[PDB]
């Protein structure tokens, strides 16, 4: 089999569509997601044209091997898609309608800057390489782009599934390649991070601040050091759900900043004890009383600054 | 091969059945389960009619490639099922009896609201897409729906395996689709959560309340902070067995509430010490004595309220 | 190809054997094990009989596609076995000797009641479904059942590999089914649990009891709470190696009971301090002295009771 | 099919190229990375030469089975590559242009000496074994070596993808072998290690040094022992992200050295308490005051020495 | 195809060789390793003999399906090897030279008694089964046994790769089987265990011994209990890298013994406090002073005894 020959010098237009059936396994660390969908293809092959009257049929059904089919691939996949051809239908004028159901693991970078209050644009890049006898270009049939209502991505809200209609045409190894960008817009369900990580982390921090109403150095050391260790556990927990980024994430920034608050609280606890031992408690009392206001105030202002820089 | 021709104008009815052999790997985080079952299919293909006198045999056995077989798929699977055809029996009128044994990983959403005292309805959706020559519709042969007595799903009780007899017929990408809903009702075996998570979590909480019978601030700080950290470990343990939900689970609610009890216990311990240092122990004694009753009472009432909201 | 025809009205007897080459990956949580073995099959096919002096050959070697082979499956497998046919030998009378080497992941429930001092009976269920032409029944050739001397299952002792000679013949979806039960008896190597979990857990518990020879409340709180937290770590460690069970395991029972001992030790430490503060140390001394005997005595008796209920 | 015959006695030159489409899963522990790329091959086959004037065709397209194709393999792969032939084009002089898209898991050793400030040279070794008829040699077509602009390896910066043009020709099992070295130069994005591991580890260490401004032995023991345990947690965390090396890594060296600082701080805290108890606090005061300078100074100098030895 | 006929009554000798290309994934817990190698086979088939003059060829190449090839298997593999035939060359006398490249996951038991200072002998068992026509026997062509210089097994040193030249011929399922033992001798790179596990474990133990220079019970309890808990963390860490063994490993023995040292240190700390409270400090002083010598001395001697029993 060979590609449909051009009537003039035109590139062959392959109309595409992706209909999402299942979305699952969005892996943050790996920056992948799994997809199960219909891939539809359509193109004109004049050599396949027929007269409905003469043939006694209005449609012709072929097997993939019987006819020419464009070699369509995904750019951003781990391995080649697992595909099963569902149908191939030819209209009297040689308009081919191809339908396959496929499953694939897609590589798509994620921006963790606003984590866990982040939104992402996942991409599925469709591609075709031109042949010596014909230049092949891709198009989007909007009537064949969509998603099942039941499509759910655990821990995420699905906003939209659209295609950038104009392909990105470029030369790769002296041949034309035509690339389409299918975009799946999602927003993270931040809900669970509040009772599981955010609030517990704030509670232990506020517990460290009770040391500002205590003259007991031994109890203070216990309050600040114990809560710091629990903060380390939360830091470790958070970093296990995320890849290593060359930038600070919102949560990462708060987690990092909280260490500074623990460090300064230890200085205060030390300074207070030192002065007490040196028979200067009036002074220690001034530092401790100031700390009761300064710590929550600087914490609130630093958080307003951070939220402003990130959102 | 092409579909069987209609005698009048009716759609082709494909009778289905699923007989469960094995159920395993119900993954809560992934919201999947693995299944090993028999899939039975039955349809009339008059082009396969034969005379037992001429052919010698009363029933014909065919290889899948030799005849037309409806392209039946599962909607909610990760990858296409691993199937092995067991038998294809054709009777004189052309009635085909198809039997395959398959294994598949099924995507089925789980409601964790009542976890670990939750029940689920797992779904296996059978589907067929219509062809141009003719419309294909699915039906349930109740005599061919069931499960092996030995079918066990580790950590769950299997209640029932039934099929919604009426298919959901709908248009998808300018063609008819016929969908059947097979339902596997299960209930979680909550037993182990009691000695492993619930009771240990209650013991550490009650241990923190011994601080209400102590005037030693340093010991109190140790009691409340240490048990809080152990509570964080249980919170982390619980959250590793669950996906992130956009709602509160029953266990999550109790776990979250317990933090408030630890936070208020630290306030009480702080207030008590502060008053004792300020030479007001009579007052501190009133707060501590009230706390001995208030903490278990408010804990019991808050739990009754939570159990009521969730069950 | 069709099944061999009956001389009278007899079912076709397929003689079976399983010879274990490798046993590996007994996964307690998943309740699975992997197996690599020979599967031998034997049946009479008269259509294949030949003269030994006329043919020249005493035995004829066939390719699987050339002859009829019974469709033998395993009931309790995750996916269909990976099989490679080794040899097919036909004797003059038409006795077929089939041999394949296969690998499979087997689902077999485990009884954790006596863990880690438990024994298990792993099952490999062989099955055949009858055809319209004739009923197929399974038999065990004991000469062809066995295991390689080098077969080792890490963490287990292999006791025996035997087959229940009488098949379970039953109707399933209007056809006969013939099931054989191959049993692999194993006993857990409990050795490592003693220096790694049992003894460390006992050492920390005995360390908590040193609080009965101390009047220092602050030190006592540290002894009992610290050791309790270490006990929680062991509880978590143990539960990660096990699935969730709707019953108590032996280790689970001991682990759970030890919490009660920590809880009562905290009460004792609290009561002791309270009395000391109330200027009643003589009394506190009576409770502490009684505790020195009561705690180890009740611990020993409770363990004798538990060992009796479980063994 | 057989290899193209030599005109004289020359070896057959197979021109190669690798164009990277996707780079993912650089696993430090496993010392592997996954790759999705184009593999291009070119060689002259005179048996395939044709006349362009009479044929009217400038190029002929063949299926892999129709013609002789060199058996090109990767040396350092886990399993054989998953390949899909994209195109085979023959020019009138018989020059064959082969293109496949493949995916593979590549074994490539990593040097962790400077971790997490390390750079690596990943290798993809292309190989061909000579046939009895003729010797096959590999060459690099630089025009067909490259990478997609969007190629991202999570946690790494991609510097260059080049090929060592001169193959390594050698005898292996009495035949010639022709090996090409494709090099992917990468540098680790160390950013996240600073707020997540380095700084937290330094904060806890500096917190242990507050014990040099405290006479409270009980508080000092708590400060040094608690932070030491947090240091053990960071040591464990770091070692989980790395394989075991027969050399010290930069981070490993710092982590190890920090233990010595904790050990000496415990000695100091012990010596200080001992002297205080022995009624020699003036002396203890001299040791403690010296420690306030000595500990940060020796820490800075030891780090300068280490950075010098490693960079 | 059938086996080559015997000239007299001799067995068919299949000469074998294994050339290691890659060694990776030595999994201690699973007792497996992955291998990528060349498998070479050689035997005489008279039926394929030719005259060089009338043929015009010195060697003849065949496709695996065209000729008889011995069914060679590996005994100790998880699944059947993934193989790709590289070459099949036939010389005039009909001597066949077969070469395949394969990858396999090999089961090979490990002796952990001296861990992490252990050495292992990994085995790759080659096997062939005899046929009714003739007995097939294996031999080693030493010229075709070897390994690539670049073969590295992460965390191990490769010593040698040799074959036991004499096969083990025995009957299995009424056919003779010819087994060859290929041995890969390796020694563990213990280096990293020293700064990561051994030394940290010794440092915390020595820190517990500072309690012998302290009269503070509260501080002593903190020193001994805290370090004990850190020892439990190291015990857990070590046991995660190892399978459960029915014997004590060298590291396991040291780890277990260290618990006894912690237990006795708690007794000493308790006894010391008890005597001090009972107004007998002179005595407590004698026990504490003796402990300062006894603990390190008994620790050194117990370690010499253990090293002697294990090495
Ligand atoms: C420690 C500090 C506590 C964390 C503060 C919340 C983070 C935040 O401020 O989050 C903000 C996001 C909203 O994001 P948005 O509108 O999607 O972003 C796009 C914004 N632009 C386009 C304007 C730039 O979430 C919320 O609705 C906050 C609800 C969570 C409350 C948690 C309380 C604990
Ligand atoms: C910490 C607070 C303790 C937790 C309270 C138990 C939860 C509960 O009350 O659980 C209730 C569930 C029963 O649920 P059901 O009949 O399946 O639900 C459907 C109910 N409708 C249809 C009426 C709405 O389990 C039990 O039988 C309780 C036994 C566990 C006791 C745990 C002791 C600790
Ligand atoms: C904490 C309490 C300590 C644990 C007590 C040992 C458990 C036990 O009693 O274990 C019992 C099993 C023996 O089992 P069996 O004969 O196979 O059982 C079948 C018995 N029937 C058929 C009679 C019912 O192990 C042993 O040989 C015990 C040796 C380990 C001692 C561990 C010391 C710590
Ligand atoms: C705890 C001690 C603090 C760690 C010190 C930083 C390590 C270092 O000095 O890292 C050095 C590397 C740069 O390395 P380079 O140029 O790639 O190496 C090749 C060099 N030759 C060719 C000259 C040999 O990273 C940096 O840019 C350092 C920035 C991180 C600061 C960390 C703050 C905490
Ligand atoms: C806690 C106590 C410290 C551990 C003692 C070292 C273990 C040992 O003694 O290790 C011994 C092995 C050497 O063994 P070999 O020659 O391979 O064995 C075969 C021996 N035969 C044939 C004679 C029986 O390693 C070494 O080179 C020791 C270097 C490690 C130093 C540890 C620093 C801490
Ligand atoms: Br693809
Ligand atoms: Br082009
Ligand atoms: Br103080
Ligand atoms: Br399917
Ligand atoms: Br107090
Ligand atoms: Br099977
Ligand atoms: Br007290
Ligand atoms: Br390859
Ligand atoms: Br002191
Ligand atoms: Br094999
Ligand atoms: Br034999
Ligand atoms: Br004391
Ligand atoms: Na085609
Ligand atoms: Na068909
Ligand atoms: Na067959
Ligand atoms: Na304390
Ligand atoms: Na070819
Ligand atoms: Na063959």
Curated annotation (Swiss-Prot), chains A, B, C, D, E:
Its main location: membrane. It holds the Pfam family Neur_chan_LBD. InterPro entries: GABAA/Glycine_rcpt, Neur_chan_lig-bd, Neur_chan_lig-bd_sf, Neur_channel, Neuro-gated_channel_TM_sf, Neuro_actylchol_rec. It is a multi-pass membrane protein. GO terms for molecular function: extracellular ligand-gated monoatomic ion channel activity; identical protein binding; potassium channel activity; sodium channel activity; transmembrane signaling receptor activity. Homopentamer. The keyword Transmembrane applies. Consists of an N-terminal ligand-binding domain that encloses a wide aqueous vestibule and a transmembrane domain that forms a narrow channel. The keyword Membrane applies. Changing residue 238 to M: Displays an increased sensitivity to propofol but not to desflurane. Cationic channel with similar permeabilities for Na(+) and K(+), that is activated by an increase of the proton concentration on the extracellular side. Displays no permeability for chloride ions. Shows slow kinetics of activation, no desensitization and a single channel conductance of 8 pS. Might contribute to adaptation to external pH change. Tetraethylammonium (TEA) and tetrabutylammonium (TBA) inhibit the proton-activated currents in a dose- and voltage-dependent manner in vitro, whereas the blocker of acid sensing ion channels, amiloride, has no effect. Channel current of GLIC can be inhibited by inhaled and intravenous general anesthetics at and below concentrations used clinically. Ion conduction is also inhibited by lidocaine and by divalent transition metal ions such as cadmium ions. Coiled coil: none annotated. SUPFAM superfamilies: Neurotransmitter-gated ion-channel transmembrane pore, Nicotinic receptor ligand binding domain-like. This is Proton-gated ion channel. It comes from the Bacteria. GO terms for cellular component: plasma membrane. The chain crosses the membrane at residues 190-212, 216-240, 249-277, 281-311. Residues 213-215, 278-280 are cytoplasmic. The homologous nature of GLIC to eukaryotic nicotinic acetylcholine receptors and other eukaryotic pentameric ligand-gated ion channels, and its sensitivity to general anesthetics, define GLIC as a structural and functional model of signal transduction in the nervous system, also relevant for exploring the molecular basis of anesthetic action.
